[PDB]
Every structure is written in C-alpha cells, then in structure tokens.
Amino acid sequence: ARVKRGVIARRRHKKILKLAKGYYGARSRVFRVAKQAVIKAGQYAYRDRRQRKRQFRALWIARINAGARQNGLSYSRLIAGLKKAAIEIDRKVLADLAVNEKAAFTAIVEKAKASLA
Amino acid sequence: AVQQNKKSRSARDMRRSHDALESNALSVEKSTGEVHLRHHVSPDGFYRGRKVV
Amino acid sequence: MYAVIVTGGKQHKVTEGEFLKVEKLDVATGEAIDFDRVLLVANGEDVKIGLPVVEGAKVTAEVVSHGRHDKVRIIKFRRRKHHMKRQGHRQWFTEIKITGIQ
Amino acid sequence: EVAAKLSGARISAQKARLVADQIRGKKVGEALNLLAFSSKKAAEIMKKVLESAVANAEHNEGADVDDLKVSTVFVNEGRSLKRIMPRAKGRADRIVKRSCHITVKVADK
Amino acid sequence: KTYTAKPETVQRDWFVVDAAGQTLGRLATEIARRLRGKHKPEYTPHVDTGDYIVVINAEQVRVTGAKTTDKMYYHHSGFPGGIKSINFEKLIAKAPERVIETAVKGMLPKNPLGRDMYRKLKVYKGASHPHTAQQPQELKI
RNA sequence: GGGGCUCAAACCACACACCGAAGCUGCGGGUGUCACGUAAGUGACGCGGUAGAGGAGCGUUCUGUAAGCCUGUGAAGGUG
RNA sequence: GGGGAGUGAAAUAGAACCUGAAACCGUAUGCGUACAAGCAGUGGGAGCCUACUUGUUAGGUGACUGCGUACCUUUUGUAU
Ligand SMILES: [Mg+2]
Ligand SMILES: [Mg+2]
Ligand SMILES: [Mg+2]
Ligand SMILES: [Mg+2]
Ligand SMILES: [Mg+2]
Ligand SMILES: [Mg+2]
Ligand SMILES: [Mg+2]
Ligand SMILES: [Mg+2]
Ligand SMILES: [Mg+2]
Ligand SMILES: [Mg+2]
Ligand SMILES: [Mg+2]
Ligand SMILES: [Mg+2]
Ligand SMILES: [Mg+2]
Ligand SMILES: [Mg+2]
Ligand SMILES: [Mg+2]
Ligand SMILES: [Mg+2]
Ligand SMILES: [Mg+2]
Ligand SMILES: [Mg+2]
C-alpha cells in the first residue's frame, strides 16, 4: 500500500502561512522563513503577557504621583497615609479618579492628610 | 566579486526608478498638416513649408 | 452615580447602566445578584468612601449570559535543545448588567 | 470597451515595460504619435496592437476613433526557449530566449 | 480600560524661567521634568503633552567649585585627528545659549519624541523674549 | 552607563516610608499520584527539564463490515 | 496573433487542449512612509477606510512608544 504524502503536507503548510500574514518581505510568503517567524512571534506573545502587567502598574503609579503633588503630597507618603486608615483602593481605580473624577480624588487626599501620615 | 546576500524586491525596484523615456519634440506642419519632429524633415519631404526631396 | 464593587479579586468602575464582563461565578442566567462589597459611593458631587467598607450600600446586578472569549496560544520553545511544546486556552467569563446603585 | 492581444512576441518583458508605462492613460490620437517616433523595438510592436484594438471598436461596435482613451496596458510573460552556449575551459552555460504577452485595452468612456 | 491622552485634544501652556544664579544642573532637571509632562495627571508616554519654556538669561548661570576653569565639552568632527574641546569659561563668552541647551538635551529620551520635546525649549542670552503675544506666566519664584 | 552633582545627587552613623520577580497571596480554569466517603458522587500537596525509561492519542493509503450508505439538485480535488 | 460569428451540455473544453496548486512576475483599489538608525516581531496605541444595523461590533492599514543579538548540528561553552 504505497502512500503519497502530497495532500496532507499541503494542509499543514497553509496552516502556517495563515498565521504568518501581514509580515514583511519573504517572511510571509516562503515557508522555510515563515516557520521561524511564527515560533519567534509566539515566544514574544508569551513573555509580553507578563510584561503587560508591569507596564500599566508603572503607568498607574506615575499618574497618582503627578496628581497627588498638585494637592500637597508625594506618592510614597500618600500610600502610607491611606494605610494608616484602611481605604483599600487599588492603583487601577485611583488613576481613574485622578483624571476624570478629580473632585472625589481631592476628598481622598484630605483624609490621608487628616490621617497625619 | 560576488554578493553575500540577495537583493529584495524593494532594493531591486528602487534601482530602476531613474529609467524612463521621452521624445516629445513634435511639431505640426503649417501647410500639409503632418506631424514630425522639431528641426527635422517631415516624412513626406517638407521642411518649413518647402518640398526638398 | 458611580460605585466601586469588588467581584473576583479585583474592582471596577461601575455606573448605573453598564454592561460588564466578570469572571465566572456560580449562578444561572436571569437571576439577580447583589453586591455588598462596595468601597466608595458618589452621587452628583456627594461622594463618600468606606472606613474599610461603605455601610448599607448595595449594587443590584443580573446575569445576561456566559461564554468563553478569545483563544490564545502558548509556545514553550528552546533554541538548539530539541524541545517545543504547545497548548491552547480559552478563559470563561460572565456578562452582567447593572440596574441600581442603592 | 474592446481588447486586443499579442500572445507570443519576441521582445522580453522587462524591456517592453518601459514603453507601456509611457502611454497608460492617454488618448489614442496622441498615443499613436508617441509610438510613431520612439526609437525602441517594443514601440513598433505595440503600435501594431494599438491600431488593432481601435479597428475592433469601429467594426464590432460603433465606437468612434476619437473618444477612445487607452485604459489598461499590461505586459505579461510567456514561454522561454532554453539553449546552451559554450564558454572557456570546457564549461558550457545556458541561455534563455524570452517572449511576452501584450494586452492593450481601449475604452470609449 | 485606562485613559490615554489624545494629540488633538491637548492643553499646552507657556512658562518663563529666570536663570540669574541658578545652579546649572539643578535648574535643568526642572525644565526637563516639565517638558516631558510629569506634572500633569494625564501623562502618557507615547504621545507628548508638555509646556513651552522660555529662558531669559542664559549667561547668568552658576556652577559650583572649580568647575568654571574645567569641564571640557568634547565633540568629534568625523575627520581623523579631529577631536575638539572647549572649557566652560571660554564657551560662555562665545555662545551662552548652548551651555544650557546641551545640559537639558542629555536629560531627555533619545527618541523622535526627544527631538520633539526639545523644540519646546527656547532660550535667550538677552533680557527679553519675542513672545509677548503668547504671554508666558512666571514659574519657580 | 550618560546628563549632571560640593551643609551633595559623595562618605560615615541612623530612622521611618515607598519602589521592586514568572517569588507568595487572591480569583478562575486543567491535570498527576495516593486516600477513602460503594475506590470521581470525593480531599490532600504535587506539575523547569537534555540523554533516556514509562503512559495515552490524531491523521494518511489499502482490506473487512460493503450487493450497505451518499452523489449529476452535483463526488474527489482547488479556493475562501 | 487577435475581435466577432457559428458547433457543442460546457471554448477561462481550441488542438503547446480534463483538473490546474506553490515559488516568480504583473495591473487596479484602499491605508502608511522623503530629520530618521539594527533578527523587522510583540505589548500599548492615535488617525483614516469599508461594511455596517449605524456603532462601550467587524474587517484592512499602524504614526508613536516599552522590551527584543534568526533556525539546525557539534560542544565545558555560539548572536557568533
Ligand atoms: Mg574544447
Ligand atoms: Mg547632614
Ligand atoms: Mg508580580
Ligand atoms: Mg508559582
Ligand atoms: Mg515535566
Ligand atoms: Mg481516494
Ligand atoms: Mg468542493
Ligand atoms: Mg448553440
Ligand atoms: Mg474553469
Ligand atoms: Mg472544462
Ligand atoms: Mg501549460
Ligand atoms: Mg471526463
Ligand atoms: Mg487546461
Ligand atoms: Mg508590484
Ligand atoms: Mg537604516
Ligand atoms: Mg541609537
Ligand atoms: Mg552535552
Ligand atoms: Mg555563521
């Protein structure tokens, strides 16, 4: 029973060349280059799920810091001021109140100063 | 000598961008109404309205 | 009218009429959900925050649907060492809808 | 619109791209004058095709020879005939001999 | 999701700095903070939101200790043996406005945003500026 | 590492605060071994990996089931 | 060599003729690029375009910006 492998090799090549479209040059059209640029573009998509969580945390902090200096503190004395009491509001929903709901942010900052910390 | 890497579709098409054509020195003869080249004998044999050949 | 409710180990910026995607919780479709874990309640300008939590305030929600979103890929490759391993993932979620900020 | 073809024409493709780009989008009155005076091998062949596309619009349709503006000129590639040629120190090498397909398409709009 | 600024909905202002005895690199760290936009709550890294700066005395600036007769400013010309140097004191009589620009330029990113944050800096060796139309407000009193 | 720094942005004592990993915690999924609660109707603490040892699967061609079943209202293929 | 016209169920079945793929080469339409440095991708992301069911939807481009020195084989050890 001779088997010829010319029809199930083709389905696996088109499955590679579909994930690898939108790429420059010969990375999107010939197979011995487009296999390297699918494995490499899958390692980057694995590392950058961790680095996504580090690039917003470093963005939330630098917006609380700018907003809390305009009222009369720093960032580091504000976090010690909120944790003298227990206000328990994270960085994602303080950097929302820093931009949009600016009057409610000032009513938080005055209570950290009243916390004397 | 030889190259070390091949040239892509971009760096091959950029070379041949300085390569176009032109021959627009055309002129209409006043008498016969025949088109020819500027400062040349018309293909019937008239130059500035005079048969020469 | 905006609250800060804490659903799945993380909190949200919930308004009066929001659709909102929450991690999967154990309740059927159509039933109503209350939230007793609100952290600041504002209204017009009248804003109050919790001492650790705000007393008395509730947020009523109900489940629209369920589902799984956006299949992602995982490639664990090592150069030059004869090792490569793949896996797929689709995380569950639960879409709810907010009615009233009590 | 009406078309014309010349499938099988001894000049190569790349040499005859330089005459197609010169006239793509003009009127056929002055298109027959750029090709009457150009000094290249492709220009005598392309004018034989351009006046074949016009005479089809006059006989197969009722299109006048005035309102025609040449719309789509493209030069494809055709079969290549492979031959050898000897070089020095025993080694012989191989020569191709190319051709092309020309398609001039005029439109009466 | 978190808010990002938009370049067609940005608010920029006009500040004027007096450098009349300020230490060079302690002045310049506050210009470079306010050109990038770390003083605004809506700071985003990828698009730019900063205030124009006008500096009105680029010759009264002060450096500390023995650095006036030192601190060569090296740069190379491309040709062989073309290294060149000029100290702090001789430079400030040739072009006073290029002392305070090269200190701020090295405290910015080296991006095509850094080249765009640098165009908001405008220094003058004189005593008045041709920006009375824009009416800059005073800061750092 | 660069700008730049002189009661310091250096050195010595010293005090709180913050920042900081795929580490720990929270929430949601998935699997391996053992224990039973008829051992999944079930808890516990486990899950980097080359050479290499062990376990469990997909697909291709031909034969049985196939004188069946599907198809000219449209097969196999090719392409979305 | 074509453009018709006729034969045929079908000439993009026309004799270099069933199906007719990939590399390679073109022609149209949309969006981005001529003061900006590198395995050319990935995370965030402005704007524009099309269909929408009129847009806390879909599709196509990706200015700007953070991290990022291909694959195999031999090796104590390779971006090399
Ligand atoms: Mg011989
Ligand atoms: Mg001291
Ligand atoms: Mg972490
Ligand atoms: Mg862990
Ligand atoms: Mg293992
Ligand atoms: Mg078969
Ligand atoms: Mg089919
Ligand atoms: Mg018939
Ligand atoms: Mg067909
Ligand atoms: Mg057929
Ligand atoms: Mg053929
Ligand atoms: Mg047949
Ligand atoms: Mg055929
Ligand atoms: Mg092209
Ligand atoms: Mg370059
Ligand atoms: Mg560089
Ligand atoms: Mg070894
Ligand atoms: Mg090598």
D–C contact: 3+ Cβ pairs < 8 A: no
Which residues from chain A sit within 8 angstroms of residue C4, using beta carbons? 89, 93
* CA gap D109, C44 in Å, rounded: 65
Burial class (CB in 10 A: 0-12, 13-18, 19+), A23: middle
Which residues from chain D sit within 8 angstroms of residue B19, using beta carbons? 18
Degrees, nearest 5: CA angle E99-E103-E107: 165
* CA gap D80, D97 in Å, rounded: 5
Separation between the CA of D72 and the C1’ of G29 (whole angstroms): 14
Nearest partner of A98 among C10, C15, E40, E10, judged by Cα: E40
* CA gap D4, D48 in Å, rounded: 10
C-alpha E99: how far from chain center:
10
Output DSSP code: residue C54: -
CA D94 to ligand 1 centroid distance, Å: 17
* CA gap A69, A71 in Å, rounded: 5
Separation between the CA of E41 and the C1’ of F23 (whole angstroms): 32
Cα-Cα-Cα-Cα torsion E93, E99, E100, E103, nearest 10 degrees, comes to -170
* Structural domains counted in chain C: 1
Residue with tokens 């939101």: E49
Q: How far is C24 from chain A (nearest CA, A)?
A: 21
* Structural domains counted in chain D: 1
Measuring CA to CA, how many Å separate C72 from each of C21, C65, C91, E1?
Answer: 18, 22, 9, 20
Please report, for the domain that includes residue D96, its CATH number: 3.90.470.10
C-alpha B32: how far from chain center:
23
CB C32 within 8 A of CB C60: yes
Domain that includes residue B35, residue range: 1-53
Q: Please report which helix (H) or strand (E) contains residue A39, including its range.
A: helix A36-69
CA B10 to ligand 15 centroid distance, Å: 14
Domain that includes residue D97, residue range: 1-109
Protein-proximal nucleotides of chain G (any atom < 7 Å from a CB): 1-4, 16, 21-28, 35-37, 39-47, 56, 60-67, 70-75, 78-79
- In this structure, how many other beta carbons lie within 10 angstroms of the beta carbon of residue C45? 8
* CA gap C71, A51 in Å, rounded: 19
CB B32 within 8 A of CB B44: yes
Output DSSP code: residue C60: E
Q: Please report which helix (H) or strand (E) contains residue D103, including its range.
A: strand D100-107
B53 touches chain D (CB under 8 A): no
Q: Do A103 and C47 touch (CB under 8 A)?
A: yes
CB E51 within 8 A of CB E12: yes
* CA gap C24, B21 in Å, rounded: 69
Phi and psi (nearest 5°) for E64?
Answer: -110, 135
CB E117 within 8 A of CB E50: yes
* CA gap B21, D16 in Å, rounded: 12
* CA gap E11, E3 in Å, rounded: 16
* CA gap C100, D80 in Å, rounded: 78
In this structure, the strands spanning C32-35 and E83-84 are: unpaired
In this structure, the strands spanning E121-123 and E52-55 are: parallel
Which residues from chain C sit within 8 angstroms of residue A45, using beta carbons? 72-73, 75
In this structure, the strands spanning E137-138 and E14-17 are: parallel
CA A10 to ligand 6 centroid distance, Å: 16
Helical axes A102-114 vs A36-69, angle rounded to 10°: 60
Separation between the CA of A1 and the C1’ of F78 (whole angstroms): 26
Q: Sheet harboring C38-42: ordered strands across?
A: C2-5, C38-42, C48-49
* CA gap A76, A83 in Å, rounded: 11
* Structural domains counted in chain B: 1
Degrees, nearest 5: CA angle D24-D25-D27: 115
What are the tokens at D83? 């031959």
CB A86 within 8 A of CB A53: no
Resolution, Å (one decimal): 3.3
Residues ≥6 apart with Cβ < 8 Å to E41: A63, A66, A67, A70, A98, A99, A102
Decide: helix, strand or coil at residue E50. Answer: coil
B28 touches chain D (CB under 8 A): no
Domain that includes residue C32, residue range: 1-102
